Design a protein around this nucleic acid. Structure first.
Length: 628
RNA sequence: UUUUUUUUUUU
Protein backbone atom coordinates (compact mmCIF):
# COMPACT_ATOMS: atom_id res chain seq x y z
CA UNK A 1 0.00 0.00 0.00
CA UNK A 2 1.01 3.69 -0.22
CA UNK A 3 4.02 4.67 1.93
CA UNK A 4 4.63 8.51 1.93
CA UNK A 5 1.96 9.03 -0.84
CA UNK A 6 -0.21 10.94 1.71
CA UNK A 7 2.81 13.22 2.44
CA UNK A 8 3.10 13.98 -1.34
CA UNK A 9 -0.59 15.09 -1.52
CA UNK A 10 -0.31 17.24 1.67
CA UNK A 11 3.08 18.73 0.49
CA UNK A 12 1.31 20.36 -2.55
CA UNK A 13 0.46 24.07 -2.07
CA UNK A 14 -3.26 23.46 -2.88
CA UNK A 15 -3.63 21.34 0.38
CA UNK A 16 -3.39 24.61 2.47
CA UNK A 17 -6.58 25.75 0.57
CA UNK A 18 -8.39 22.34 0.67
CA UNK A 19 -11.33 23.22 3.03
CA UNK A 20 -11.79 26.71 1.38
CA UNK A 21 -12.17 25.42 -2.26
CA UNK A 22 -14.70 22.69 -1.20
CA UNK A 23 -16.73 25.54 0.48
CA UNK A 24 -16.31 27.81 -2.61
CA UNK A 25 -17.79 25.04 -4.94
CA UNK A 26 -20.87 24.43 -2.69
CA UNK A 27 -21.27 28.29 -2.42
CA UNK A 28 -20.90 29.06 -6.19
CA UNK A 29 -22.34 27.14 -9.21
CA UNK A 30 -19.54 28.52 -11.48
CA UNK A 31 -16.07 29.32 -9.97
CA UNK A 32 -12.77 30.55 -11.52
CA UNK A 33 -9.61 28.81 -10.14
CA UNK A 34 -6.23 30.51 -10.82
CA UNK A 35 -3.51 28.01 -9.79
CA UNK A 36 0.11 29.03 -10.58
CA UNK A 37 2.32 26.29 -12.16
CA UNK A 38 3.19 24.01 -9.12
CA UNK A 39 -0.17 24.36 -7.28
CA UNK A 40 -1.32 20.73 -7.81
CA UNK A 41 -4.93 21.86 -8.63
CA UNK A 42 -5.09 19.40 -11.60
CA UNK A 43 -4.58 16.20 -9.45
CA UNK A 44 -6.19 17.32 -6.13
CA UNK A 45 -9.38 19.43 -6.73
CA UNK A 46 -11.15 16.47 -8.43
CA UNK A 47 -10.28 14.30 -5.34
CA UNK A 48 -11.11 17.06 -2.76
CA UNK A 49 -14.69 17.22 -4.17
CA UNK A 50 -15.08 13.36 -4.35
CA UNK A 51 -13.87 13.17 -0.66
CA UNK A 52 -16.63 15.73 0.27
CA UNK A 53 -19.32 13.47 -1.34
CA UNK A 54 -19.86 15.41 -4.64
CA UNK A 55 -19.63 11.97 -6.34
CA UNK A 56 -22.85 10.57 -4.73
CA UNK A 57 -25.46 11.57 -7.37
CA UNK A 58 -23.09 12.72 -10.15
CA UNK A 59 -19.74 11.88 -11.82
CA UNK A 60 -16.79 14.36 -11.70
CA UNK A 61 -15.45 15.37 -15.15
CA UNK A 62 -12.15 17.24 -15.77
CA UNK A 63 -11.18 18.28 -19.35
CA UNK A 64 -7.53 18.56 -20.53
CA UNK A 65 -6.39 20.12 -23.84
CA UNK A 66 -4.04 17.15 -24.54
CA UNK A 67 -4.65 13.34 -24.68
CA UNK A 68 -1.34 12.58 -22.91
CA UNK A 69 -2.35 14.85 -19.95
CA UNK A 70 -5.78 13.18 -19.58
CA UNK A 71 -4.08 9.72 -19.30
CA UNK A 72 -1.09 10.90 -17.17
CA UNK A 73 -3.29 12.92 -14.73
CA UNK A 74 -5.78 10.01 -14.47
CA UNK A 75 -2.97 7.48 -13.80
CA UNK A 76 -1.48 9.73 -11.05
CA UNK A 77 -4.93 10.46 -9.50
CA UNK A 78 -5.75 6.70 -9.57
CA UNK A 79 -2.55 5.76 -7.66
CA UNK A 80 -3.26 8.51 -5.06
CA UNK A 81 -6.86 7.14 -4.79
CA UNK A 82 -5.46 3.57 -4.58
CA UNK A 83 -7.84 2.09 -7.20
CA UNK A 84 -7.14 0.34 -10.56
CA UNK A 85 -7.08 2.76 -13.55
CA UNK A 86 -10.55 2.68 -15.17
CA UNK A 87 -12.36 1.92 -11.86
CA UNK A 88 -13.09 4.78 -9.31
CA UNK A 89 -10.69 7.02 -11.40
CA UNK A 90 -10.73 6.83 -15.25
CA UNK A 91 -10.03 8.74 -18.47
CA UNK A 92 -11.82 9.02 -21.84
CA UNK A 93 -9.99 9.98 -25.09
CA UNK A 94 -10.60 9.21 -28.79
CA UNK A 95 -10.20 5.37 -29.30
CA UNK A 96 -9.54 4.82 -25.53
CA UNK A 97 -12.61 4.90 -23.21
CA UNK A 98 -10.94 3.65 -19.97
CA UNK A 99 -14.01 3.97 -17.67
CA UNK A 100 -16.32 1.49 -15.85
CA UNK A 101 -19.72 1.68 -14.04
CA UNK A 102 -17.56 2.36 -10.88
CA UNK A 103 -15.80 5.56 -12.16
CA UNK A 104 -16.58 8.57 -9.89
CA UNK A 105 -13.67 10.77 -11.26
CA UNK A 106 -13.26 11.00 -15.10
CA UNK A 107 -10.45 12.95 -16.87
CA UNK A 108 -11.08 13.53 -20.62
CA UNK A 109 -9.96 15.72 -23.55
CA UNK A 110 -12.06 18.98 -23.97
CA UNK A 111 -12.89 17.59 -27.47
CA UNK A 112 -14.51 14.52 -25.84
CA UNK A 113 -16.82 16.62 -23.57
CA UNK A 114 -17.70 18.71 -26.71
CA UNK A 115 -18.74 15.48 -28.51
CA UNK A 116 -20.57 14.15 -25.35
CA UNK A 117 -22.54 17.42 -24.92
CA UNK A 118 -24.03 16.93 -28.46
CA UNK A 119 -25.72 13.60 -27.39
CA UNK A 120 -26.46 14.89 -23.80
CA UNK A 121 -26.82 18.72 -23.75
CA UNK A 122 -27.48 18.69 -19.93
CA UNK A 123 -24.49 16.30 -19.26
CA UNK A 124 -26.77 14.31 -16.89
CA UNK A 125 -24.05 11.73 -15.94
CA UNK A 126 -21.83 14.52 -14.40
CA UNK A 127 -22.30 16.33 -11.03
CA UNK A 128 -19.19 18.58 -11.54
CA UNK A 129 -17.31 19.76 -14.68
CA UNK A 130 -13.81 21.24 -14.33
CA UNK A 131 -12.17 22.74 -17.47
CA UNK A 132 -8.40 22.44 -16.80
CA UNK A 133 -5.71 24.31 -18.81
CA UNK A 134 -8.37 26.92 -19.80
CA UNK A 135 -5.50 29.47 -20.51
CA UNK A 136 -4.49 27.33 -23.60
CA UNK A 137 -7.78 28.56 -25.26
CA UNK A 138 -8.33 25.47 -27.47
CA UNK A 139 -11.41 25.81 -29.77
CA UNK A 140 -13.01 22.93 -27.76
CA UNK A 141 -12.40 24.75 -24.43
CA UNK A 142 -13.75 28.10 -25.87
CA UNK A 143 -16.87 26.21 -27.22
CA UNK A 144 -17.34 24.59 -23.77
CA UNK A 145 -17.33 28.06 -22.08
CA UNK A 146 -20.40 29.11 -24.12
CA UNK A 147 -22.28 25.74 -23.92
CA UNK A 148 -21.67 25.27 -20.14
CA UNK A 149 -22.69 28.92 -19.45
CA UNK A 150 -26.08 27.92 -21.05
CA UNK A 151 -26.05 24.47 -19.31
CA UNK A 152 -25.68 26.12 -15.83
CA UNK A 153 -29.05 27.92 -16.28
CA UNK A 154 -30.62 24.57 -17.37
CA UNK A 155 -29.25 22.61 -14.34
CA UNK A 156 -28.89 24.40 -10.93
CA UNK A 157 -27.35 21.27 -9.21
CA UNK A 158 -24.36 20.99 -11.68
CA UNK A 159 -21.13 22.75 -10.51
CA UNK A 160 -18.56 24.17 -13.02
CA UNK A 161 -14.92 25.07 -12.24
CA UNK A 162 -12.98 26.99 -14.93
CA UNK A 163 -9.17 27.47 -14.61
CA UNK A 164 -7.45 30.73 -15.76
CA UNK A 165 -4.07 32.49 -15.95
CA UNK A 166 -3.81 35.46 -13.51
CA UNK A 167 -4.06 38.10 -16.37
CA UNK A 168 -7.42 36.72 -17.77
CA UNK A 169 -9.03 35.95 -14.33
CA UNK A 170 -11.17 39.16 -14.21
CA UNK A 171 -12.09 38.70 -17.95
CA UNK A 172 -13.25 35.04 -17.37
CA UNK A 173 -15.15 36.29 -14.27
CA UNK A 174 -17.21 38.97 -16.13
CA UNK A 175 -17.95 36.33 -18.87
CA UNK A 176 -19.28 33.83 -16.23
CA UNK A 177 -21.94 36.11 -14.64
CA UNK A 178 -19.16 37.86 -12.53
CA UNK A 179 -18.67 34.71 -10.31
CA UNK A 180 -15.76 34.71 -7.77
CA UNK A 181 -12.01 34.07 -8.48
CA UNK A 182 -10.15 31.58 -6.16
CA UNK A 183 -6.30 32.06 -6.34
CA UNK A 184 -3.87 29.25 -5.25
CA UNK A 185 -0.07 29.86 -5.08
CA UNK A 186 2.36 27.49 -6.90
CA UNK A 187 5.88 26.17 -6.06
CA UNK A 188 8.09 27.68 -8.88
CA UNK A 189 11.66 29.18 -8.47
CA UNK A 190 12.96 32.68 -9.39
CA UNK A 191 14.25 33.19 -13.01
CA UNK A 192 16.66 36.07 -13.84
CA UNK A 193 15.47 37.73 -17.11
CA UNK A 194 18.28 39.21 -19.35
CA UNK A 195 17.08 41.52 -22.17
CA UNK A 196 19.45 42.34 -25.13
CA UNK A 197 20.81 46.01 -25.16
CA UNK A 198 20.69 46.39 -29.04
CA UNK A 199 18.30 44.18 -31.09
CA UNK A 200 19.85 41.15 -32.92
CA UNK A 201 19.63 41.30 -36.77
CA UNK A 202 19.62 37.44 -37.06
CA UNK A 203 17.70 35.65 -34.20
CA UNK A 204 19.02 32.15 -35.23
CA UNK A 205 22.69 33.28 -35.03
CA UNK A 206 22.00 35.39 -31.89
CA UNK A 207 20.41 32.33 -30.18
CA UNK A 208 23.45 30.20 -31.18
CA UNK A 209 25.78 32.97 -29.87
CA UNK A 210 23.84 33.10 -26.54
CA UNK A 211 24.01 29.27 -26.20
CA UNK A 212 27.84 29.24 -26.56
CA UNK A 213 28.28 32.04 -23.94
CA UNK A 214 26.02 30.20 -21.42
CA UNK A 215 27.90 26.93 -22.00
CA UNK A 216 31.30 28.69 -21.53
CA UNK A 217 30.46 31.57 -19.12
CA UNK A 218 27.77 30.01 -16.87
CA UNK A 219 27.53 27.43 -14.01
CA UNK A 220 26.20 23.84 -14.53
CA UNK A 221 22.62 23.60 -15.87
CA UNK A 222 20.89 22.45 -19.10
CA UNK A 223 19.72 24.93 -21.79
CA UNK A 224 16.26 25.06 -23.50
CA UNK A 225 16.27 27.21 -26.73
CA UNK A 226 12.99 27.94 -28.61
CA UNK A 227 13.15 28.11 -32.42
CA UNK A 228 10.30 27.92 -34.99
CA UNK A 229 10.67 25.02 -37.46
CA UNK A 230 12.06 21.47 -37.77
CA UNK A 231 14.31 22.43 -40.73
CA UNK A 232 15.58 25.51 -38.80
CA UNK A 233 16.07 23.39 -35.62
CA UNK A 234 17.81 20.56 -37.56
CA UNK A 235 20.17 23.10 -39.24
CA UNK A 236 20.92 24.84 -35.89
CA UNK A 237 22.04 21.56 -34.24
CA UNK A 238 24.52 20.85 -37.10
CA UNK A 239 25.84 24.47 -36.96
CA UNK A 240 26.20 24.32 -33.10
CA UNK A 241 27.94 20.86 -33.37
CA UNK A 242 30.39 22.22 -36.07
CA UNK A 243 31.19 25.26 -33.81
CA UNK A 244 31.87 23.17 -30.63
CA UNK A 245 34.12 20.77 -32.68
CA UNK A 246 36.01 23.87 -34.09
CA UNK A 247 36.86 24.76 -30.40
CA UNK A 248 39.41 22.19 -29.02
CA UNK A 249 38.70 18.85 -27.27
CA UNK A 250 39.71 20.81 -24.05
CA UNK A 251 36.08 22.25 -23.67
CA UNK A 252 33.30 20.36 -21.76
CA UNK A 253 30.95 18.18 -23.92
CA UNK A 254 27.70 19.99 -24.89
CA UNK A 255 24.98 17.45 -25.92
CA UNK A 256 22.78 18.94 -28.73
CA UNK A 257 19.21 17.44 -28.90
CA UNK A 258 16.36 18.53 -31.24
CA UNK A 259 12.71 18.35 -30.04
CA UNK A 260 9.66 18.68 -32.38
CA UNK A 261 6.31 16.90 -33.04
CA UNK A 262 7.59 15.50 -36.39
CA UNK A 263 10.55 13.79 -34.61
CA UNK A 264 10.09 10.01 -33.98
CA UNK A 265 9.28 8.97 -30.36
CA UNK A 266 12.51 6.92 -29.97
CA UNK A 267 14.58 10.08 -30.79
CA UNK A 268 12.25 12.25 -28.59
CA UNK A 269 12.90 10.07 -25.47
CA UNK A 270 16.66 10.89 -25.34
CA UNK A 271 15.94 14.57 -24.39
CA UNK A 272 14.81 13.20 -20.94
CA UNK A 273 18.00 11.06 -20.36
CA UNK A 274 20.27 12.91 -17.86
CA UNK A 275 23.62 14.55 -18.90
CA UNK A 276 26.71 12.35 -18.17
CA UNK A 277 29.04 13.80 -15.44
CA UNK A 278 30.65 17.20 -16.45
CA UNK A 279 28.50 17.50 -19.64
CA UNK A 280 25.79 20.10 -20.41
CA UNK A 281 22.54 19.43 -22.34
CA UNK A 282 21.02 21.97 -24.82
CA UNK A 283 17.53 21.09 -26.12
CA UNK A 284 16.62 23.01 -29.34
CA UNK A 285 12.78 23.00 -29.37
CA UNK A 286 9.68 24.47 -31.00
CA UNK A 287 6.96 25.84 -28.68
CA UNK A 288 6.20 22.12 -28.05
CA UNK A 289 8.49 22.58 -24.97
CA UNK A 290 6.34 25.45 -23.48
CA UNK A 291 3.47 23.18 -22.18
CA UNK A 292 3.24 19.82 -24.08
CA UNK A 293 6.74 18.32 -23.32
CA UNK A 294 8.24 18.84 -19.81
CA UNK A 295 12.06 18.39 -19.50
CA UNK A 296 13.62 17.99 -15.99
CA UNK A 297 16.80 19.86 -14.95
CA UNK A 298 16.43 22.89 -17.25
CA UNK A 299 17.94 26.07 -15.70
CA UNK A 300 18.71 28.28 -18.78
CA UNK A 301 16.23 29.33 -21.51
CA UNK A 302 17.15 31.10 -24.78
CA UNK A 303 14.01 32.96 -26.00
CA UNK A 304 14.63 34.55 -29.44
CA UNK A 305 10.91 35.59 -29.28
CA UNK A 306 9.58 33.93 -32.51
CA UNK A 307 6.88 31.26 -33.00
CA UNK A 308 5.26 29.99 -36.20
CA UNK A 309 1.51 30.83 -35.80
CA UNK A 310 -1.53 29.73 -37.83
CA UNK A 311 -3.84 32.48 -39.23
CA UNK A 312 -6.88 31.69 -41.50
CA UNK A 313 -7.81 34.09 -44.37
CA UNK A 314 -11.46 33.15 -45.16
CA UNK A 315 -11.70 35.41 -48.26
CA UNK A 316 -8.80 33.34 -49.84
CA UNK A 317 -9.48 29.93 -48.12
CA UNK A 318 -5.78 29.96 -47.09
CA UNK A 319 -3.91 29.31 -43.78
CA UNK A 320 -0.72 31.36 -43.15
CA UNK A 321 2.25 29.87 -41.19
CA UNK A 322 4.30 33.03 -40.63
CA UNK A 323 7.20 33.43 -38.07
CA UNK A 324 5.71 36.16 -35.79
CA UNK A 325 6.73 37.74 -32.44
CA UNK A 326 5.54 35.64 -29.44
CA UNK A 327 3.04 37.04 -26.87
CA UNK A 328 4.19 38.32 -23.45
CA UNK A 329 2.47 35.33 -21.76
CA UNK A 330 4.29 33.00 -24.24
CA UNK A 331 7.61 34.70 -23.28
CA UNK A 332 6.71 34.22 -19.58
CA UNK A 333 5.79 30.55 -20.19
CA UNK A 334 9.18 30.14 -21.99
CA UNK A 335 11.08 31.93 -19.15
CA UNK A 336 9.26 29.87 -16.44
CA UNK A 337 10.72 26.58 -17.89
CA UNK A 338 14.10 27.41 -16.25
CA UNK A 339 12.56 27.83 -12.77
CA UNK A 340 10.47 24.56 -12.63
CA UNK A 341 13.22 22.28 -11.15
CA UNK A 342 15.34 24.96 -9.37
CA UNK A 343 16.26 28.67 -9.78
CA UNK A 344 17.41 29.70 -13.31
CA UNK A 345 18.17 32.40 -15.97
CA UNK A 346 16.32 33.24 -19.29
CA UNK A 347 18.12 35.10 -22.14
CA UNK A 348 15.50 37.05 -24.18
CA UNK A 349 17.17 38.34 -27.41
CA UNK A 350 15.07 41.56 -27.47
CA UNK A 351 14.90 44.91 -25.57
CA UNK A 352 12.83 45.23 -22.33
CA UNK A 353 10.83 48.05 -24.02
CA UNK A 354 10.17 45.70 -26.98
CA UNK A 355 8.72 43.14 -24.53
CA UNK A 356 6.71 45.89 -22.75
CA UNK A 357 5.43 47.97 -25.73
CA UNK A 358 6.05 45.87 -28.89
CA UNK A 359 4.59 42.51 -27.69
CA UNK A 360 0.87 41.65 -27.26
CA UNK A 361 0.05 40.69 -23.62
CA UNK A 362 -1.73 37.45 -24.72
CA UNK A 363 -1.62 35.18 -27.83
CA UNK A 364 -4.74 35.46 -30.07
CA UNK A 365 -7.06 32.54 -29.08
CA UNK A 366 -7.37 29.72 -31.69
CA UNK A 367 -11.13 30.25 -32.33
CA UNK A 368 -10.19 33.71 -33.80
CA UNK A 369 -7.61 32.39 -36.37
CA UNK A 370 -8.72 28.87 -37.56
CA UNK A 371 -11.31 27.77 -40.19
CA UNK A 372 -14.57 27.15 -38.18
CA UNK A 373 -16.57 25.01 -40.73
CA UNK A 374 -16.14 22.09 -38.20
CA UNK A 375 -17.15 24.05 -35.05
CA UNK A 376 -20.19 25.63 -36.80
CA UNK A 377 -21.53 22.24 -38.06
CA UNK A 378 -21.34 20.90 -34.46
CA UNK A 379 -23.17 23.99 -33.03
CA UNK A 380 -25.86 23.65 -35.78
CA UNK A 381 -26.28 19.95 -34.79
CA UNK A 382 -26.70 21.08 -31.09
CA UNK A 383 -29.73 23.18 -32.27
CA UNK A 384 -28.08 26.70 -32.30
CA UNK A 385 -28.88 28.99 -35.31
CA UNK A 386 -28.05 32.73 -34.97
CA UNK A 387 -24.31 31.86 -34.60
CA UNK A 388 -23.29 35.44 -35.52
CA UNK A 389 -24.93 36.38 -32.11
CA UNK A 390 -23.59 33.27 -30.22
CA UNK A 391 -22.05 33.99 -26.77
CA UNK A 392 -18.28 33.30 -27.41
CA UNK A 393 -15.89 34.77 -24.78
CA UNK A 394 -13.73 35.99 -27.70
CA UNK A 395 -15.90 36.13 -30.88
CA UNK A 396 -14.15 35.01 -34.12
CA UNK A 397 -13.95 37.39 -37.14
CA UNK A 398 -17.43 37.89 -38.71
CA UNK A 399 -16.09 37.16 -42.25
CA UNK A 400 -14.69 33.79 -41.03
CA UNK A 401 -18.07 32.65 -39.59
CA UNK A 402 -20.00 33.84 -42.70
CA UNK A 403 -17.66 31.87 -45.09
CA UNK A 404 -17.97 28.75 -42.85
CA UNK A 405 -21.83 29.10 -43.04
CA UNK A 406 -21.56 29.55 -46.87
CA UNK A 407 -19.40 26.37 -47.13
CA UNK A 408 -21.89 24.29 -45.06
CA UNK A 409 -24.66 25.63 -47.38
CA UNK A 410 -22.68 24.56 -50.52
CA UNK A 411 -22.16 20.97 -49.12
CA UNK A 412 -25.90 20.52 -48.36
CA UNK A 413 -25.46 20.63 -44.56
CA UNK A 414 -27.69 23.80 -44.36
CA UNK A 415 -30.78 24.85 -46.41
CA UNK A 416 -31.42 28.37 -47.95
CA UNK A 417 -32.57 29.66 -44.43
CA UNK A 418 -29.35 28.25 -42.78
CA UNK A 419 -31.18 25.44 -40.81
CA UNK A 420 -29.45 22.01 -40.42
CA UNK A 421 -30.46 19.46 -43.15
CA UNK A 422 -30.81 15.65 -42.65
CA UNK A 423 -27.42 15.37 -44.52
CA UNK A 424 -25.85 18.01 -42.17
CA UNK A 425 -26.94 16.09 -39.03
CA UNK A 426 -25.36 12.90 -40.55
CA UNK A 427 -22.11 14.82 -41.40
CA UNK A 428 -21.96 16.05 -37.76
CA UNK A 429 -21.59 12.39 -36.58
CA UNK A 430 -18.22 12.16 -38.49
CA UNK A 431 -15.26 13.46 -36.42
CA UNK A 432 -13.64 15.42 -39.33
CA UNK A 433 -14.14 18.75 -41.26
CA UNK A 434 -17.44 18.79 -43.23
CA UNK A 435 -15.69 18.63 -46.68
CA UNK A 436 -14.24 15.18 -45.71
CA UNK A 437 -17.59 13.83 -44.38
CA UNK A 438 -19.20 15.13 -47.66
CA UNK A 439 -16.70 13.05 -49.70
CA UNK A 440 -17.24 9.89 -47.57
CA UNK A 441 -21.00 10.17 -48.30
CA UNK A 442 -20.50 11.01 -52.02
CA UNK A 443 -18.22 7.91 -52.19
CA UNK A 444 -21.20 5.51 -51.54
CA UNK A 445 -23.15 6.61 -54.68
CA UNK A 446 -19.84 6.56 -56.70
CA UNK A 447 -18.97 2.96 -55.46
CA UNK A 448 -15.53 3.90 -53.90
CA UNK A 449 -16.25 4.19 -50.08
CA UNK A 450 -13.59 1.48 -49.33
CA UNK A 451 -10.79 3.58 -50.89
CA UNK A 452 -12.30 6.87 -49.63
CA UNK A 453 -12.28 5.74 -45.96
CA UNK A 454 -8.53 4.99 -46.33
CA UNK A 455 -7.88 8.35 -48.02
CA UNK A 456 -9.92 10.32 -45.39
CA UNK A 457 -8.05 8.43 -42.59
CA UNK A 458 -4.71 9.71 -44.06
CA UNK A 459 -5.86 13.38 -44.38
CA UNK A 460 -6.20 13.67 -40.54
CA UNK A 461 -2.53 12.59 -39.97
CA UNK A 462 0.51 14.84 -39.27
CA UNK A 463 4.02 14.35 -40.81
CA UNK A 464 3.19 11.15 -42.80
CA UNK A 465 6.63 11.24 -44.59
CA UNK A 466 9.90 11.44 -42.58
CA UNK A 467 12.66 13.56 -44.16
CA UNK A 468 15.84 13.39 -41.96
CA UNK A 469 18.57 16.02 -42.78
CA UNK A 470 21.40 13.62 -43.87
CA UNK A 471 19.09 11.25 -45.88
CA UNK A 472 16.68 13.71 -47.66
CA UNK A 473 17.28 12.32 -51.21
CA UNK A 474 17.00 8.67 -49.93
CA UNK A 475 13.62 9.52 -48.25
CA UNK A 476 12.20 11.26 -51.38
CA UNK A 477 13.38 8.26 -53.57
CA UNK A 478 11.42 5.85 -51.28
CA UNK A 479 8.36 8.22 -51.22
CA UNK A 480 8.31 8.38 -55.09
CA UNK A 481 7.77 4.54 -55.22
CA UNK A 482 4.16 5.34 -53.99
CA UNK A 483 3.41 8.34 -56.35
CA UNK A 484 0.14 7.93 -58.29
CA UNK A 485 0.04 9.72 -61.69
CA UNK A 486 -3.22 11.49 -60.58
CA UNK A 487 -1.53 13.05 -57.49
CA UNK A 488 -1.50 12.95 -53.67
CA UNK A 489 -4.97 11.52 -52.67
CA UNK A 490 -4.29 8.12 -54.44
CA UNK A 491 -0.60 8.31 -53.22
CA UNK A 492 -2.03 8.29 -49.61
CA UNK A 493 -4.14 5.22 -50.67
CA UNK A 494 -0.98 3.55 -52.08
CA UNK A 495 1.00 4.27 -48.84
CA UNK A 496 -1.77 2.90 -46.54
CA UNK A 497 -2.13 -0.23 -48.79
CA UNK A 498 1.68 -0.88 -48.95
CA UNK A 499 1.86 -0.63 -45.10
CA UNK A 500 -1.12 -3.05 -44.73
CA UNK A 501 0.49 -5.51 -47.26
CA UNK A 502 3.75 -5.22 -45.17
CA UNK A 503 1.74 -6.68 -42.19
CA UNK A 504 1.62 -3.19 -40.53
CA UNK A 505 5.46 -3.55 -40.02
CA UNK A 506 7.39 -0.85 -38.03
CA UNK A 507 10.50 -2.06 -39.94
CA UNK A 508 8.74 -1.31 -43.32
CA UNK A 509 7.90 2.22 -42.04
CA UNK A 510 11.59 2.77 -40.99
CA UNK A 511 13.00 1.39 -44.30
CA UNK A 512 10.53 3.55 -46.45
CA UNK A 513 10.96 6.79 -44.33
CA UNK A 514 7.28 6.70 -43.15
CA UNK A 515 6.16 7.67 -39.58
CA UNK A 516 4.65 4.54 -37.96
CA UNK A 517 2.88 6.88 -35.42
CA UNK A 518 0.92 8.37 -38.39
CA UNK A 519 0.02 5.01 -40.00
CA UNK A 520 -1.05 3.68 -36.54
CA UNK A 521 -3.44 6.64 -35.96
CA UNK A 522 -4.80 6.43 -39.54
CA UNK A 523 -5.71 2.76 -38.93
CA UNK A 524 -7.50 3.68 -35.65
CA UNK A 525 -9.37 6.48 -37.57
CA UNK A 526 -10.25 4.03 -40.39
CA UNK A 527 -11.79 1.61 -37.80
CA UNK A 528 -13.82 4.39 -36.10
CA UNK A 529 -14.91 5.79 -39.52
CA UNK A 530 -16.03 2.31 -40.71
CA UNK A 531 -18.17 1.88 -37.54
CA UNK A 532 -19.82 5.30 -38.19
CA UNK A 533 -20.48 4.23 -41.83
CA UNK A 534 -22.20 0.96 -40.74
CA UNK A 535 -24.38 2.96 -38.30
CA UNK A 536 -25.75 5.15 -41.17
CA UNK A 537 -26.23 1.95 -43.28
CA UNK A 538 -23.65 3.04 -45.92
CA UNK A 539 -22.03 -0.03 -47.48
CA UNK A 540 -18.21 -0.10 -47.83
CA UNK A 541 -17.62 -0.59 -51.61
CA UNK A 542 -14.34 -0.97 -53.55
CA UNK A 543 -14.01 0.78 -56.94
CA UNK A 544 -11.30 -1.74 -57.97
CA UNK A 545 -9.08 -0.25 -60.72
CA UNK A 546 -11.74 2.44 -61.47
CA UNK A 547 -10.00 5.21 -59.45
CA UNK A 548 -11.78 7.98 -61.48
CA UNK A 549 -14.71 7.24 -59.04
CA UNK A 550 -12.51 8.43 -56.08
CA UNK A 551 -11.61 11.70 -57.89
CA UNK A 552 -15.30 12.31 -58.86
CA UNK A 553 -16.37 11.81 -55.21
CA UNK A 554 -13.59 14.24 -54.00
CA UNK A 555 -15.16 16.92 -56.30
CA UNK A 556 -18.33 16.63 -54.08
CA UNK A 557 -16.56 18.17 -51.05
CA UNK A 558 -13.53 20.12 -52.41
CA UNK A 559 -14.93 22.00 -55.45
CA UNK A 560 -14.09 25.34 -53.74
CA UNK A 561 -10.40 24.28 -53.49
CA UNK A 562 -9.76 24.06 -57.27
CA UNK A 563 -7.15 25.61 -59.63
CA UNK A 564 -6.26 25.69 -63.36
CA UNK A 565 -2.68 25.79 -64.79
CA UNK A 566 -1.25 29.18 -66.04
CA UNK A 567 -1.83 27.66 -61.17
CA UNK A 568 -4.66 30.17 -60.36
CA UNK A 569 -7.70 29.35 -58.10
CA UNK A 570 -10.95 29.05 -60.13
CA UNK A 571 -12.99 30.91 -57.44
CA UNK A 572 -10.74 33.99 -56.93
CA UNK A 573 -7.94 33.48 -59.51
CA UNK A 574 -5.24 33.93 -56.81
CA UNK A 575 -1.88 32.39 -57.91
CA UNK A 576 -1.05 29.11 -56.01
CA UNK A 577 1.81 26.56 -56.34
CA UNK A 578 2.37 22.77 -56.24
CA UNK A 579 4.21 21.73 -53.05
CA UNK A 580 7.60 20.08 -53.79
CA UNK A 581 6.47 17.00 -51.76
CA UNK A 582 3.51 16.52 -54.21
CA UNK A 583 3.27 13.50 -56.56
CA UNK A 584 2.25 16.16 -59.17
CA UNK A 585 5.41 18.27 -58.65
CA UNK A 586 7.34 17.46 -61.86
CA UNK A 587 4.05 16.71 -63.69
CA UNK A 588 1.48 18.43 -66.00
CA UNK A 589 -2.17 18.66 -64.87
CA UNK A 590 -4.46 21.42 -66.20
CA UNK A 591 -7.24 21.12 -63.56
CA UNK A 592 -6.44 20.38 -59.88
CA UNK A 593 -8.29 19.94 -56.57
CA UNK A 594 -6.38 20.42 -53.26
CA UNK A 595 -7.12 19.51 -49.62
CA UNK A 596 -5.76 22.77 -48.11
CA UNK A 597 -3.94 25.93 -49.29
CA UNK A 598 -1.16 27.15 -46.90
CA UNK A 599 1.11 30.20 -47.28
CA UNK A 600 4.57 29.39 -45.77
CA UNK A 601 7.27 30.86 -48.12
CA UNK A 602 4.79 30.43 -51.07
CA UNK A 603 0.99 29.92 -51.44
CA UNK A 604 1.30 26.08 -51.55
CA UNK A 605 -1.58 23.70 -52.41
CA UNK A 606 -1.50 20.58 -50.14
CA UNK A 607 -2.46 17.03 -51.30
CA UNK A 608 -3.23 18.26 -54.88
CA UNK A 609 -4.98 15.79 -57.27
CA UNK A 610 -5.55 16.14 -61.07
CA UNK A 611 -9.30 16.35 -61.96
CA UNK A 612 -11.59 16.78 -65.02
CA UNK A 613 -13.69 20.02 -65.27
CA UNK A 614 -16.90 18.02 -66.09
CA UNK A 615 -16.79 16.39 -62.58
CA UNK A 616 -16.93 19.85 -60.89
CA UNK A 617 -20.23 20.75 -62.68
CA UNK A 618 -21.45 17.13 -62.04
CA UNK A 619 -20.64 17.21 -58.26
CA UNK A 620 -21.63 20.89 -57.55
CA UNK A 621 -24.23 21.88 -60.20
CA UNK A 622 -25.29 25.17 -58.48
CA UNK A 623 -21.68 26.41 -57.78
CA UNK A 624 -20.51 26.19 -61.46
CA UNK A 625 -22.20 28.16 -64.33
CA UNK A 626 -21.05 27.43 -67.94
CA UNK A 627 -20.04 30.16 -70.46
CA UNK A 628 -18.18 30.40 -73.81
C1' U B 1 8.03 26.08 -59.44
C1' U B 2 12.10 23.18 -54.03
C1' U B 3 9.24 21.72 -48.35
C1' U B 4 4.11 23.16 -41.82
C1' U B 5 4.10 25.63 -35.44
C1' U B 6 0.96 23.15 -31.96
C1' U B 7 -3.50 20.29 -30.89
C1' U B 8 -8.58 17.88 -30.63
C1' U B 9 -13.58 14.12 -32.04
C1' U B 10 -18.41 8.02 -33.72
C1' U B 11 -23.35 6.57 -31.86
Amino acid sequence: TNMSIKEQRESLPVFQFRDQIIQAVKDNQILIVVGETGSGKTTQVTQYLAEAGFTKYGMIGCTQPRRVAAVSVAKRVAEEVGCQLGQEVGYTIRFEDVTSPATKIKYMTDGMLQREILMDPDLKRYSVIMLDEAHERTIATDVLFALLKKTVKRRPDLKVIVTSATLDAEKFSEYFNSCPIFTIPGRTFPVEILYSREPEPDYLEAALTTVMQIHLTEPPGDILVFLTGQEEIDTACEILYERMKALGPSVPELIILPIYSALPSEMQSRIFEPAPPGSRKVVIATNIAETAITIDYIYYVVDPGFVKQNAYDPKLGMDSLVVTPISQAQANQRAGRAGRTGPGKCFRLYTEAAYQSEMLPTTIPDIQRQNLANTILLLKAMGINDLLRFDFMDPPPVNTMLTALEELYALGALDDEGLLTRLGRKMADFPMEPSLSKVLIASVDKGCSDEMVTIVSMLNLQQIFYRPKDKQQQADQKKAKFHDPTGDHLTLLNVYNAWKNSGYSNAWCFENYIQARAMRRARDVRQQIVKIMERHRHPIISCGRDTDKIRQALCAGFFRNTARKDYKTLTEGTPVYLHPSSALFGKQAEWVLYHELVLTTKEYMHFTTAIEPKWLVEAAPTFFKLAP
